[PDB]
DNA sequence: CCGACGCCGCATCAGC
DNA sequence: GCTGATGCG
DNA sequence: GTCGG
């Protein structure tokens, strides 16, 4: 549905969500507001009353009341007030820096650090992640056109194969479902040598190679199974530089790889639906495994999975192309 | 009425 | 120094 | 804040 349909309502609910998460530190209210905003965003009619909205799942009494105030007055008194609150708006804003969460944002504002300029002037109060988040503040908020995701994927797949042609690497996320833009790049990596009952440095060797060709530019976090950092496509000698981008690389044991690919391909709604159906057929699927459930509900041992389609076959579902996993 | 609302790797803190 | 908790994503 | 056991 077009924004003009209920965009005022859904914008209000998203703003309220952000203040619950970042200022009130009420994560379940953040998700409640997000859920309400999403069910309304998909409603194909211009809402006329709170009562009409309350019929949708995730909209309750209090959001219905807020919708009534918004429809009658064009605003919400509580939102107008917190918007102009210097401390609350600064706390909310600072959490847009990757690495600054609600706790750090509150501590910064408490000691008078409220803006990007304030952070800039106080480097020694920032940890490594937060320094990177500040350095790439604008770039990290830009989306990534699919054409650049393809160029990025070209680099990742080539360098991974260069390190060891037995690696398997899959770029997941909405990109794998065919999205025309992405927010970041999520790479799932495995190697036949690595199983859940099992080489050294398997993730390190790939990260190192991507740094050696100057694709990975910074590291936010790095361990034996998960890397989170920053990358940048090369620019033509004369053209403007590409924005720096967020890339994650996860090393997963081969026997759990396709459960991971499935989960991290999504969508979120599709995953929920597939897990729901799985339980109906007596299986429990999580990010790692699919296990049979006995007649008393006791989970059995993980079942062998050698492809995404194996998982579909277990639950008697015909294979769904990533492109068709919107729900 | 009242608990659930995902989970866990990594960086860093709190406490010992 | 180690162990567990917390913040963050 | 909403849902539901």
Residue numbers in the entry: 7 to 204, 207 to 335
Sentences from the paper on this structure:
N6-(2-deoxy-α,β-d-erythro-pentofuranosyl)-2,6-diamino-4-hydroxy-5-formamido-pyrimidine (Fapy•dG) is a DNA lesion derived from a common precursor to 8-OxodGuo. Herein, we examine biochemical and structural aspects of DNA replication involving Fapy•dG and Fapy•dGTP using human DNA polymerase β (Pol β), a model polymerase. The ability of Fapy•dG to adopt multiple stereoisomers (conformational and configurational) increases the possible ways in which a polymerase and other repair proteins can interact with it. Overall, stereochemical dynamics due to configurational and conformational changes contribute significantly to the effects of Fapy•dG on the polymerase activity of Pol β.
The Pol β extension experiments were corroborated by X-ray crystallography studies in which we characterized Fapy•dG at the primer 3′-terminal position opposite dC, dA and T. Initial characterization of a binary Fapy•dG-dC was accomplished via crystallization of Pol β and Fapy•dG-dC containing DNA. The resulting crystal diffracted to 1.69 Å and was solved in space group P21 with Pol β in the open conformation. Fapy•dG forms a Watson–Crick base pair with dC consisting of typical hydrogen bond distances and we only observed the β-Fapy•dG anomer. The pyrimidine ring adopts a conformation such that the formamide group is positioned in the major groove of DNA and is coordinated by a single ordered water molecule. The Fapy•dG-dC base pair is in a stable conformation, as indicated by clear electron density and similar average B-factors of 25.2 Å2 for Fapy•dG and 26.7 Å2 for dC. Overall, the active site is in position to allow binding of the incoming nucleotide.
